[PDB]
Write a protein that binds this ligand. Structure first.
Ligand SMILES: *[C@@H]1O[C@H](CO)[C@@H](O[C@@H]2O[C@H](CO)[C@@H](O)[C@H](O)[C@H]2NC(C)=O)[C@H](O)[C@H]1NC(C)=O
Ligand SMILES: *[C@@H]1O[C@H](CO)[C@@H](O[C@@H]2O[C@H](CO)[C@@H](O)[C@H](O)[C@H]2NC(C)=O)[C@H](O)[C@H]1NC(C)=O
Ligand SMILES: CC(C)C[C@H](NC(=O)[C@@H](O)[C@H](N)Cc1ccccc1)C(=O)O
Ligand SMILES: *[C@@H]1O[C@H](CO)[C@@H](O)[C@H](O)[C@H]1NC(C)=O
Ligand SMILES: [K+]
Ligand SMILES: [K+]
Ligand SMILES: [Zn+2]
Length: 858
């Protein structure tokens, strides 16, 4: 019988130091290790439980300090634990070293100690071996006390062949020849840290480097054929690292930081201390072929991972229930940092957007509080979602606006200083912020310990402004938040603030107003509804003088109008009437928000027998933006904002067959193709151009023939997108089969390819079938409940709208039993489908008839 029956490890055996030897064979795909960990026991025990997953342990011994003893090894593969059995008890307070020799196979997934491949520009296959342990995979590389609060120092030794280069968290102290054809690289001992942050990579990478003003050596690593795309990320890393050292008032503790581009990577990037890892697409920039969105993306990702060096590495959450302490803060700092470091990106314009994303999931019963209990690996992995990231960021933005920016800054600095090299709970952050009436802790508990967000309802009767709060949920709570409300009026540009702490309250204006708008700049995780003549007043404002409020305010009105349709407070008709203001809009955020609210309506239709209204609805959309579409140049000119807007509108108009866009596109593609790819296309039109070109066999085959050889993450992305738009079912199967096989398109792309095909009007049946027939191998490759699996579940089902379809979805996921039926994402699609059924049963006919009335304009 295994002597320990909990998922969590015992509390009373604590490691202080690991000494890790790793010898990998990149030709036989095998590895051998020797882990030594120094421990002490606070209670007496002759059993030591630690984590191990898929390692074959050959031998385990216990050292006293001279004296050595063999330990009996027991295995519990479900708990992912081994029991080491001592012949004598451990004496309390005395030091012991546990020594374990074991072996493994390089993982073929994207986690643990795993295999990654690439092609040389001369066509030769190349293997490297990299790591990804967050949250629970460290234990697949080396046996350990694999929970984030057992922090320890690490001394890492990698044995390898001369032709390879090894890198890890810390600098290389020395390289020792241990046998003919075998070198041992010794890395310097780390600072105290969590096991999930250990990293190592064995490759033939090349590097470029730059020294910060503070003496940190920053380096980017990539494969030899792509190292000339590292320059932009290197400049960015230096600037951002310098920024944070100043902002947090705590220098970066390590002598070097490396940023490595991995050719096979499941997430976008990872914060391992001193050795941050990235998808190639999240790190490498090509001056001539990369997009504005990709440049924006590299900067933010680097910003994010370097933020983690303080938030996550230096100060770490005690347990994964409080993961948002790492991920919410990192996501937020992206915006804090990059808006000083790269003001030309104007990233603050886009902050709002994440908040609305979170609200899509958070408005459902299947959401969870920011801070919420989890126990097993799949549960822990599911914390890496939009609540921990995006709501975590949003509520911090909210707290920040509520104290000064300086006060906020002071709190986080005291917090980082006090908890340096340690672990925090949710309550520790609040004690810090509470020590800079004002009660931050009660306030921030409402935002972290209960799910969802409030609807604030505004009633104006003369000078009295009645504010009311209740819990927003799509189909009892009595939940209450402390909401920092902001607002502006027709009489002053000055922003007014009210802390609504109660179900209702009232303020008195010094004079009556033509109009009033709440949640200014959308710095608040809540939505607003206006009673009486309120929305007609706001709709009249956007139709007469839209620039009376900001872009961001316009975007928030659009979103809230449609969110309120979904719970019955506003009619679909009044919201679409508001949409009409977009005829005159010019700014990226409200145009994109409109689209975010309107495209999904035709998406639901596309999956039904509804072609008359689908077509009317799409005509209306293009007509709504037609002026802004016709005003776009087929160039790469302007700000990042202008470019992203350009690229999206051109794609949109061409996908909906607006004939002037299409003919131009056809023409660009013909000349491109007839030069055999030699002509340079403007990057911003290339999506639109490839999408049109891929509608012919000639064009699709041609496009695919360039994918083989491309080195540009953007160009590959653009080709992927275009090929997935084909209406030939045999080609959509191929793409699905191939990316899954991973040889001609890499499997890291499969999730998104599966989603784009699920979005294809004639592809959705194929994508839903493929996910079902291939579930087990996909779960093995990506893990339950990773984001990837989550994105696949929702990407293939969340646009369904019928009961027949709901029963399909329910029946499949139920059959999976212990292998997927408890997944949070499955509950989320189900409730999404359920909301789709009712939204469409109510509004379908209303839209049909509204589209007709809106031609009493002709
Ligand atoms: C590494 O992979 C090999 C081969 O895929 C594993 O060895 C096999 O184990 C299976 C299943 O128990 C046996 O039926 C086979 O006969 C084995 N093949 C060989 C060549 O030994 C091996 O277990 C893996 N290592 C670890 C730790 O899991
Ligand atoms: C990994 O395993 C290979 C295959 O056994 C090792 O093989 C060396 O390389 C070639 C390929 O077979 C042989 O001709 C050599 O003679 C083998 N070793 C030597 C010293 O000559 C390879 O060295 C191993 N790599 C690691 C890192 O352990
Ligand atoms: C939010 C993005 C800008 C980048 C993001 N990376 C991170 O959050 C890292 O800080 C995470 N700590 C890495 C991670 C992601 C998924 C599973 C395990 C581990 C990612 O999506 O990978
Ligand atoms: C909301 O959540 C809980 C947990 O799954 C459940 O008991 C309850 O049925 C849910 N409410 C509705 C309307 O489904
Ligand atoms: K400073
Ligand atoms: K969960
Ligand atoms: Zn992160």
């Amino acid at each position: 019988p295994f002597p320990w029956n909990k998922i969590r490890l015992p509390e009373y055996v604590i490691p202080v130091h690991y000494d890790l030897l790793i010898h990998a064979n990149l030709t036989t795909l095998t590895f051998w290790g020797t882990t030594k960990v120094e421990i002490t026991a606070s209670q007496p025990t002759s059993t030591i439980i630690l984590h191990s997953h898929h390692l074959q342990i050959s031998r385990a011994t216990l050292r006293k300090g001279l004296s050595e003893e063999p330990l009996q090894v027991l295995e519990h593969p479900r708990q992912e634990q081994i029991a080491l059995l001592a012949p004598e008890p451990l004496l309390v307070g005395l030091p012991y070293t546990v020594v374990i020799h074991y072996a493994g196979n390089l993982s073929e997934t994207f986690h643990g100690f795993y295999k990654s491949t690439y092609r040389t520009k001369e066509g030769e296959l190349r293997i490297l071996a990299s790591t990804q342990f967050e949250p629970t995979a460290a234990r697949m590389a080396f046996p350990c006390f694999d929970e984030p609060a057992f922090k320890a120092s690490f001394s890492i030794k990698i044995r390898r062949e001369p032709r390879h280069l090894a890198i890890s968290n810390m600098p290389l102290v020395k390289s020792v020849t241990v046998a003919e054809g075998l070198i041992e690289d010794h890395f310097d001992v780390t600072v105290k840290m969590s096991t999930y942050l250990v990293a190592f990579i064995i490759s033939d990478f090349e590097s470029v480097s730059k020294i910060t003003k503070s003496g940190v050596k920053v380096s980017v690593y990539a494969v030899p054929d792509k190292i000339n795309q590292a320059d932009y990320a290197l400049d960015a890393a230096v600037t951002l690292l310098e920024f944070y050292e100043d902002y947090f008032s705590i220098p970066y503790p390590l002598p070097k930081q490396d940023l490595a581009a991995i050719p096979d990577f499941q997430s976008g990037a990872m914060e391992n201390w001193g050795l941050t890892t990235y998808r190639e697409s999240a790190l490498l920039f090509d001056a001539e072929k990369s997009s504005a969105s990709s440049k924006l993306g590299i900067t933010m990702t680097v910003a994010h991972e370097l933020a983690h060096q303080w938030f996550g590495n230096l100060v770490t959450m005690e347990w994964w229930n409080d993961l948002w302490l790492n991920e919410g803060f990192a996501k937020f700092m992206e915006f804090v940092s990059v808006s000083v470091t790269h003001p030309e990106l104007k990233v603050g314009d886009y902050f709002f957007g994440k908040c609305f994303d979170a609200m899509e999931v958070d408005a459902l019963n299947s959401s969870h509080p920011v801070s919420t209990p989890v126990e097993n690996p799949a549960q822990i992995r599911e914390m890496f979602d939009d609540v921990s990231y995006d709501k975590g960021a949003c509520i911090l933005n909210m707290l920040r606006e509520y104290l000064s920016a300086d006060a906020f800054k002071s709190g986080i600095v005291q917090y980082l200083q006090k908890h340096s090299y340690k672990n925090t709970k949710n309550e520790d952050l609040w004690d810090s912020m509470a020590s800079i009436g004002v009660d931050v802790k009660t306030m921030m508990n409402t935002w972290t310990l209960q799910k969802g967000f409030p609807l604030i309802t505004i009633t104006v009767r003369g000078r009295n402004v009645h504010m009311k709060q209740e819990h927003y949920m799509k189909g009892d709570t009595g939940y209450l938040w402390h909401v920092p409300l902001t607002f502006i009026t027709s009489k002053s540009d000055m922003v007014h603030r009210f802390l609504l702490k109660t179900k209702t309250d009232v303020l008195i204006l010094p004079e009556e107003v033509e109009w009033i708008k709440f949640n200014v700049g959308m710095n608040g995780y809540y939505i607003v509804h206006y009673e009486d003549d309120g929305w007609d007043s706001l709709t009249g404002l956007l139709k007469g003088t839209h620039t009376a409020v900001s872009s961001n305010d316009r975007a928030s009105l659009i979103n809230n109008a449609f969110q309120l349709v979904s719970i019955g407070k506003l009619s679909i008709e009044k919201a679409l009437d508001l949409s009409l203001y977009l005829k005159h809009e010019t700014e990226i955020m409200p145009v994109f928000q409109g689209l975010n609210e309107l495209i999904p309506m035709y998406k639901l239709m596309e999956k039904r027998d509804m072609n008359e209204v689908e077509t009317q609805f799409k005509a209306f959309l293009i007509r709504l933006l037609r002026d802004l579409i016709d005003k776009q140049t087929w160039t790469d000119e302007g700000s990042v904002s202008e470019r992203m807007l350009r690229s999206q509108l051109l794609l949109l108009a061409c996908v909906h067959n607006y004939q002037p866009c299409v003919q131009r596109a056809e023409g660009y593609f013909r000349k491109w193709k007839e030069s055999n790819g030699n002509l340079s296309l403007p990057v911003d039109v290339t999506l639109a151009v490839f999408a049109v070109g891929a509608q012919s066999t000639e064009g699709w085959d041609f496009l695919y023939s360039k994918y083989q050889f491309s080195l540009s993450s953007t160009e590959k992305s653009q080709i992927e997108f275009a090929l997935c738009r084909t209406q030939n079912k045999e080609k959509l199967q191929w793409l699905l089969d191939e990316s899954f096989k991973g040889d001609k398109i890499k499997t890291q792309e499969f999730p998104q390819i599966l989603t784009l095909i699920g979005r294809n009007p004639v592809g959705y049946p194929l994508a839903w079938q493929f996910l079902r027939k291939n579930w087990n191998k996909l779960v093995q490759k990506f893990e339950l409940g990773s984001s990837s699996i989550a994105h696949m579940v929702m990407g293939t089902t969340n646009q369904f709208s019928t009961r027949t379809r709901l029963e399909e979805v329910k029946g499949f996921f139920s059959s999976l039993k212990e292998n997927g039926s408890q997944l949070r994402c499955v509950q989320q699609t189900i409730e999404t489908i359920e909301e789709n059924i009712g939204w469409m049963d109510k509004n379908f006919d209303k839209i049909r008839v509204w589209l007709q009335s809106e031609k009493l304009e002709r």
